[PDB]
Design a protein around this ligand. Structure first.
Ligand SMILES: [Ca+2]
Length: 223
């Protein structure tokens, strides 16, 4: 996250870290056994880390659970990043408390102008490299379809949205991928892509979760 603030320990209780010997992507806990992330985060041998704040120190609220199964969206296109969403089932159910909770799936799609919370352990610099050990947060508006498609001509599909600041300075970045965009207490987005970070007229691009709810429910019911 560039240009954000330090969330505070366990203030984003649904935030997951995906670990394969190291933190590589974020995710969201959507129930005691299921995590939603970005399909471009697909790896073998994922361990899901819950209850994290400092990812380099054991602070006492962690739950480390391996993935049993990973399901990439049937129509994921890695060249276009269209349908950039993945489901991860835990080997065991997480113990849900105030510090480790699930986030609700949306009933409706959020509109342009809605303020959302984006969080993760990604790079905090727009030029150069600096990775935080603690969770970073950013409040950002959902931009209009028009402004989005005009920033990224020919690249935005129905399954995407832009959020952030056309002025730049504040964005998601490398390492934030797969993490939540939560608006009015519901999971609306997944940190998907962008052209660099926090650059002028190049906002973050997010997977539009409201388009996938039916797929999510069906999959979870049968797996
Ligand atoms: Ca920790």
């Amino acid at each position: 996250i560039v240009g954000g603030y330090t969330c505070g320990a366990n203030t984003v209780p649904y935030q997951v870290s995906l670990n394969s010997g190291y933190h590589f992507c974020g995710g969201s806990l959507i129930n005691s056994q299921w995590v939603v992330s970005a399909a471009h985060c697909y790896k073998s041998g994922i361990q899901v880390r819950l209850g994290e704040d400092n990812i380099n120190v054991v602070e006492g609220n962690e739950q480390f659970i391996s993935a049993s199964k990973s399901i990439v969206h049937p129509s994921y296109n890695s060249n276009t990043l269209n349908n950039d969403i993945m489901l991860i089932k835990l080997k065991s159910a997480a113990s849900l408390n105030s510090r480790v909770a699930s986030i609700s799936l949306p009933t409706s799609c959020a509109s342009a102008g809605t303020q959302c919370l984006i969080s993760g352990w990604g790079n905090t610099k727009s030029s150069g490299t600096s990775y935080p050990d603690v969770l970073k947060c950013l409040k950002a508006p959902i931009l209009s379809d028009s402004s989005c498609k005009s920033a990224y001509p020919g690249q935005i599909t129905s399954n995407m949205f832009c959020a952030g600041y056309l002025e730049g300075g504040k964005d998601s970045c490398q390492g934030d991928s797969g993490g939540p965009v939560v608006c009015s207490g519901k999971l609306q987005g997944i940190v998907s892509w962008g052209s660099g970070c926090a650059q002028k007229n190049k906002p973050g691009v997010y997977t539009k979760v409201c388009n996938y709810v039916s797929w999510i429910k069906q999959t979870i019911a049968s797996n």
